[PDB]
């Protein structure tokens, strides 16, 4: 009866079902957990918001077209405006979180295409000016739930001031490595003939027990079309990709007034 | 007359000392001494002060 294709995930007041899964990945074989006393750093009693924040948040959907080059998000950036998770994140200097990432993309038995879904620790990307190095604005690095897109062309700006964004070049994974090697990162593939969803469970990953969520993204989420969307009756068809992410084992330290980041 | 002692831990562990000289002045640094009594400077008071009690009763 039980199947690698059929899964239920419940966190807080939220449940996901899938009937065409392909198992689930636990990044580096490690389930998320709370911070042990023997690895702790800040000494204030932490906030552990539990079900208020540790629940599935669904981002705005994106459209997969035959011409799409791919999509990226950063975490916890993508969830910074999500209910009580966002409030706990911005009221505290420090936060840590694992995640359940659920990527959703259904089609038909007559569609074809394959998405690589990669969870990348410290997903540092190239800037878009050759007048400077490491020259990216906070606003362009932290787009929130809209994330960003890859391009198949690199056109760095004439003026340094116009190039303060990522050069998200697909085949170099936006960071000077070949995209074919992205499989060293925790991943699944959504191959439309096989599966309609990817599930990645991510532990907290950092060189520290806990860090400034508003300064630092622990994970990149990359969705690359490895094989282009094709549908014989309409080559210009679009199918949605929906990203749903639950924080897990969230813990916050250093309560004060709320952080309100710059928007320009 | 070799002395075997614990090393200070690194990134990831005993070491051996033999004294070669007849004068202790020739010896390498004294072993780590973690002794401390801050109270002789931070609380040099005649009558014990219990933190939870009033300083002046």
């Amino acid at each position: 009866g039980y199947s690698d294709r059929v899964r239920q995930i419940t966190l807080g007041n939220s449940t996901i079902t899938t009937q065409e899964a392909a198992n689930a990945v636990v990044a580096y074989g490690e389930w998320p957990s709370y911070l042990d006393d023997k690895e702790a750093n800040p000494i204030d009693a932490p906030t552990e918001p539990d079900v208020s924040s540790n629940r599935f948040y669904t981002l705005d959907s994106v459209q997969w077209k035959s011409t799409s080059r791919g999509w990226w998000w950063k975490l916890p950036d993508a969830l910074k405006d999500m209910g009580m998770f966002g409030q706990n994140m911005y009221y505290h200097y420090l936060g840590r979180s694992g995640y359940t990432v659920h990527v959703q993309c259904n089609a038909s038995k007559f569609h074809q295409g394959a998405l690589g879904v990669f969870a990348i620790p410290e997903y540092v990307m190239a800037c878009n000016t050759e007048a400077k190095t490491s020259y990216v604005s906070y606003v362009n690095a932290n787009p929130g739930e809209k994330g960003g897109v890859f391009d198949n062309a690199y056109n760095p700006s004439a003026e340094a001031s116009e190039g303060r964004k990522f050069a998200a070049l697909d085949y170099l994974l936006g960071c000077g490595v070949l995209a074919g090697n992205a499989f060293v990162y925790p991943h699944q593939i959504i191959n439309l003939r096989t599966n309609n969803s990817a599930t990645l469970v991510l532990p907290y990953v950092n060189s520290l027990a806990i860090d400034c969520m508003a300064k630092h993204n622990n994970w990149g989420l990359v969705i690359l079309p490895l094989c282009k969307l094709d549908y014989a009756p309409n080559s210009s068809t679009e199918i949605p990709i929906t990203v749903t992410i639950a924080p897990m084992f969230t813990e916050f330290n250093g309560l004060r007034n709320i952080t309100v980041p710059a928007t320009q | 007359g070799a002395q075997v002692s614990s090393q200070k831990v690194g990134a990831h562990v005993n070491y051996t000392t033999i004294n070669y000289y007849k004068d202790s002045a020739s010896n390498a640094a004294s072993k780590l001494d973690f002794s401390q009594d801050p109270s002789k400077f931070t609380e040099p008071v005649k009558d014990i002060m219990i933190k939870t009690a009033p300083a002046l009763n």
Binding site: - | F34, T42, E43, V45, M49, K51, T52, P54, A55
Partner: peptide
């Protein structure tokens, strides 16, 4: 020998007032 660990503590509502002192004492 290590620097001091922090114990688990919650709040108080008490006649014990460790926040107040008198540095006139020389402490």
């Amino acid at each position: 020998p290590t620097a001091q660990s922090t114990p688990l503590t919650s709040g108080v509502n008490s006649q014990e007032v460790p926040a107040l002192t008198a540095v006139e004492t020389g402490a």
